[PDB]
Amino acid sequence: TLKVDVKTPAGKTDGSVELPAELFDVEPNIALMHQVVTAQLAAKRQGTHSTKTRGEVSGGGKKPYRQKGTGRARQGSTRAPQFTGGGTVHGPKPRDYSQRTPKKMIAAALRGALSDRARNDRIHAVTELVEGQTPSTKSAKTFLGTLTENKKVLVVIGRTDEVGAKSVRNLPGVHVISPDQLNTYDVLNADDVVFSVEALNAYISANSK
State the residues that interact with RNA by CB under 7 A. 41-42, 44-52, 57-62, 78, 84-86, 88, 91-92, 97, 135-138, 141, 166-167, 169-172
Q: How far is the CB of 121 from RNA (least distance, A)?
A: 26
* Closer CB to RNA, 17 or 140, in the complex: 140
Q: Is the Cβ–Cβ distance between 140 and 165 less than 8 Å?
A: no
* Closer CB to RNA, 3 or 34, in the complex: 34
Compute the C-alpha angle 8/11/15, nearest 5°: 50
* Closer CB to RNA, 43 or 206, in the complex: 43
Q: How far is the CB of 86 from RNA (least distance, A)?
A: 7
CA distance 187 to 177: 10
Q: How far is the CB of 146 from RNA (least distance, A)?
A: 14
Q: How far is the CB of 186 from RNA (least distance, A)?
A: 15
Residue 7 makes CB contacts below 8 A (sequence gap 6+) with: 13, 14, 124, 125, 126, 127, 147
Q: Specify the amino acid at residue 170.
A: N
* Closer CB to RNA, 58 or 208, in the complex: 58
Closest CA to 37 of 94, 110, 133, 103: 110
Q: E strand or H helix at 77, and its extent?
A: none
* Closer CB to RNA, 51 or 70, in the complex: 51
* Rg, the chain, Cα only: 27
CA distance 162 to 22: 31
Q: How far is the CB of 180 from RNA (least distance, A)?
A: 22
- CA-CA distances (angstroms) from residue 49 to 63, 79, 93? 30, 21, 6
